Design an enzyme around this catalytic site. Structure first.
Site, PDB file in Angstrom:
ATOM      1  N   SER A  71     -22.474 -16.283 -15.630  1.00  0.00           N
ATOM      2  CA  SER A  71     -23.658 -16.567 -16.523  1.00  0.00           C
ATOM      3  C   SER A  71     -23.393 -17.785 -17.383  1.00  0.00           C
ATOM      4  CB  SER A  71     -23.950 -15.437 -17.515  1.00  0.00           C
ATOM      5  OG  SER A  71     -24.429 -14.301 -16.774  1.00  0.00           O
ATOM      6  N   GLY A  72     -24.403 -18.602 -17.544  1.00  0.00           N
ATOM      7  CA  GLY A  72     -24.291 -19.823 -18.372  1.00  0.00           C
ATOM      8  C   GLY A  72     -23.753 -21.014 -17.668  1.00  0.00           C
ATOM      9  N   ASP A 120     -33.972 -18.743 -20.624  1.00  0.00           N
ATOM     10  CA  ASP A 120     -32.536 -18.412 -20.849  1.00  0.00           C
ATOM     11  C   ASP A 120     -31.657 -19.681 -20.849  1.00  0.00           C
ATOM     12  OD1 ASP A 120     -30.261 -16.817 -21.080  1.00  0.00           O
ATOM     13  OD2 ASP A 120     -30.286 -16.191 -19.003  1.00  0.00           O
ATOM     14  N   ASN A 160      -6.886 -22.752 -14.399  1.00  0.00           N
ATOM     15  CA  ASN A 160      -6.379 -21.342 -14.595  1.00  0.00           C
ATOM     16  C   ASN A 160      -6.756 -21.031 -16.061  1.00  0.00           C
ATOM     17  OD1 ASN A 160      -4.890 -18.993 -15.350  1.00  0.00           O
ATOM     18  ND2 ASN A 160      -3.433 -19.427 -13.842  1.00  0.00           N
ATOM     19  N   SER A 178     -23.395 -15.733  -7.267  1.00  0.00           N
ATOM     20  CA  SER A 178     -22.635 -15.924  -8.517  1.00  0.00           C
ATOM     21  C   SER A 178     -22.633 -14.426  -8.950  1.00  0.00           C
ATOM     22  CB  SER A 178     -23.421 -16.904  -9.479  1.00  0.00           C
ATOM     23  OG  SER A 178     -24.786 -16.507  -9.500  1.00  0.00           O
ATOM     24  N   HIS A 200     -28.493 -15.828 -23.209  1.00  0.00           N
ATOM     25  CA  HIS A 200     -27.936 -14.463 -23.312  1.00  0.00           C
ATOM     26  C   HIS A 200     -26.408 -14.491 -23.455  1.00  0.00           C
ATOM     27  CE1 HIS A 200     -27.158 -14.427 -18.761  1.00  0.00           C
ATOM     28  NE2 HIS A 200     -26.098 -13.828 -19.201  1.00  0.00           N
ATOM     29  N   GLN A 212     -21.253 -11.547 -12.468  1.00  0.00           N
ATOM     30  CA  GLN A 212     -20.937 -11.484 -13.929  1.00  0.00           C
ATOM     31  C   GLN A 212     -19.645 -12.274 -14.211  1.00  0.00           C
ATOM     32  OE1 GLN A 212     -19.960  -7.506 -15.216  1.00  0.00           O
ATOM     33  NE2 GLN A 212     -19.964  -6.857 -13.139  1.00  0.00           N
ATOM     34  N   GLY A 213     -19.762 -13.057 -15.236  1.00  0.00           N
ATOM     35  CA  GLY A 213     -18.656 -13.920 -15.679  1.00  0.00           C
ATOM     36  C   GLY A 213     -19.083 -15.344 -15.390  1.00  0.00           C
ATOM     37  N   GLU A 246      -6.415 -29.332 -20.921  1.00  0.00           N
ATOM     38  CA  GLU A 246      -7.338 -28.509 -21.720  1.00  0.00           C
ATOM     39  C   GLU A 246      -7.599 -29.111 -23.098  1.00  0.00           C
ATOM     40  OE1 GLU A 246      -4.441 -27.126 -20.417  1.00  0.00           O
ATOM     41  OE2 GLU A 246      -4.948 -25.258 -19.499  1.00  0.00           O
TER      42      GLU A 246
HETATM   43  N1  LIG Z   1     -25.968 -11.792  -9.147  1.00  0.00           N
HETATM   44  C1  LIG Z   1     -25.982 -12.873  -9.889  1.00  0.00           C
HETATM   45  N2  LIG Z   1     -26.390 -14.017  -9.394  1.00  0.00           N
HETATM   46  C2  LIG Z   1     -25.570 -12.830 -11.227  1.00  0.00           C
HETATM   47  C3  LIG Z   1     -25.333 -14.030 -11.968  1.00  0.00           C
HETATM   48  C4  LIG Z   1     -24.922 -14.028 -13.315  1.00  0.00           C
HETATM   49  C5  LIG Z   1     -24.748 -12.811 -13.907  1.00  0.00           C
HETATM   50  N3  LIG Z   1     -24.372 -12.509 -15.109  1.00  0.00           N
HETATM   51  C6  LIG Z   1     -24.364 -11.209 -15.116  1.00  0.00           C
HETATM   52  C7  LIG Z   1     -24.069 -10.435 -16.237  1.00  0.00           C
HETATM   53  C8  LIG Z   1     -23.864  -9.059 -16.127  1.00  0.00           C
HETATM   54  C9  LIG Z   1     -23.574  -8.274 -17.227  1.00  0.00           C
HETATM   55  C10 LIG Z   1     -23.488  -8.856 -18.476  1.00  0.00           C
HETATM   56  C11 LIG Z   1     -23.680 -10.234 -18.665  1.00  0.00           C
HETATM   57  C12 LIG Z   1     -23.582 -10.781 -19.959  1.00  0.00           C
HETATM   58  C13 LIG Z   1     -24.284 -10.249 -21.051  1.00  0.00           C
HETATM   59  C14 LIG Z   1     -24.168 -10.793 -22.326  1.00  0.00           C
HETATM   60  C15 LIG Z   1     -23.340 -11.882 -22.532  1.00  0.00           C
HETATM   61  C16 LIG Z   1     -22.641 -12.422 -21.474  1.00  0.00           C
HETATM   62  C17 LIG Z   1     -22.769 -11.871 -20.221  1.00  0.00           C
HETATM   63  C18 LIG Z   1     -23.973 -10.991 -17.509  1.00  0.00           C
HETATM   64  O1  LIG Z   1     -24.171 -12.348 -17.579  1.00  0.00           O
HETATM   65  N4  LIG Z   1     -24.719 -10.604 -13.996  1.00  0.00           N
HETATM   66  C19 LIG Z   1     -24.958 -11.661 -13.250  1.00  0.00           C
HETATM   67  C20 LIG Z   1     -25.368 -11.607 -11.916  1.00  0.00           C
HETATM   68 CA   LIG Z   2      -5.582 -23.184 -18.384  1.00  0.00          CA
END
Ligand SMILES: NC(=[NH2+])c1ccc2[nH]c(-c3cccc(-c4ccccc4)c3[O-])nc2c1
Ligand SMILES: [Ca+2]
Ligand SMILES: [Cl-]
Length: 223
Positions: free
Chosen positions: A177-178, A84, A54, A172, A40, A174-175, A62
């Site tokens: 993911s992956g 995923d 940073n 974890s 995703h 948002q930000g 880097e």
């Molecule tokens: N609670 C958790 N353990 C968690 C972990 C990873 C997440 N990643 C996200 C997430 C939320 C909104 C948008 C994206 C997103 C959607 C498309 C591309 C990249 C990120 C997220 O990965 N929520 C997340 C929540």
């Molecule tokens: Ca840097």
């Protein structure tokens, strides 16, 4: 990462930032030309940034490389997030050293109770948005399948596992993911989804990498 700590510069040398003008997902370097991330997180115009701490300052170490191709798992389901996982091939190979290194794929799946390290540049607030400049870390255990399925009834497939704290406070977000879930030096998970961040009884769900090792190996061998 909510409730985590500052990793320390380059202490997680296989961590990568996927960039398209800003940081949008994490990933793991598994060899000098391939990264593993979440399906995703797929988009075009991805620049993989290695040796970072940073993400807003060039501090040295880097390596910014463009992705030559991204391979989303053919059975990825965006509604369930089942499968995923995504592989990214780099335009050129990265120079591995002590600050940029790959992480090993597992030979076996991990057991509940195994303690793992989750890292990333995601949100550090459960109620609000605060994005850090440097890499954050969290140590968290894999939960049993019964607790996971009892938390997310009907939404956990055999390609997912929960890791985290049911009391809330650490997770974890948002930000992240992956990014990587490393247990005993092997990549066992990929940050995938969750309900909010660090909420009570709503642990994070991760992609179970041990289920895709032959897929990763055959795909890399043919690309
Ligand atoms: N609670 C958790 N353990 C968690 C972990 C990873 C997440 N990643 C996200 C997430 C939320 C909104 C948008 C994206 C997103 C959607 C498309 C591309 C990249 C990120 C997220 O990965 N929520 C997340 C929540
Ligand atoms: Ca840097
Ligand atoms: Cl169920």
């Amino acid at each position: 990462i909510v409730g985590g700590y500052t990793c320390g510069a380059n202490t997680v040398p296989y961590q990568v930032s996927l960039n398209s003008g800003y940081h949008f997902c994490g990933g793991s370097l598994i060899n000098s030309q391939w990264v593993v991330s979440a399906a995703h997180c797929y988009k075009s115009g991805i620049q993989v940034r290695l040796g970072e701490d940073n993400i807003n300052v060039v501090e040295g170490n880097e390596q910014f490389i463009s992705a030559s191709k991204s391979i989303v798992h053919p059975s990825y389901n965006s509604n369930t997030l089942n499968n995923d996982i995504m592989l990214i091939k780099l335009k050129s190979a990265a120079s591995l050293n002590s600050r940029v290194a790959s992480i090993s794929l597992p030979t076996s799946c991990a057991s509940a109770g195994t303690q793992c390290l989750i890292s990333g540049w995601g949100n550090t607030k459960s109620s609000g948005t605060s994005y850090p400049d440097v890499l954050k870390c969290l140590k968290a255990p894999i939960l049993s399948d019964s607790s996971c399925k009892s938390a997310y009834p009907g939404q956990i497939t055999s390609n997912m596992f929960c890791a985290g704290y049911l009391e809330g406070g650490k997770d974890s977000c948002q930000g992240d993911s992956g990014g990587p879930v490393v247990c005993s030096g092997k990549l066992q998970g990929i940050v995938s989804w969750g309900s909010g961040c660090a909420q009570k009884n709503k642990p994070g769900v991760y992609t179970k990498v041990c289920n895709y090792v032959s897929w990763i190996k055959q795909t890399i061998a043919s690309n």
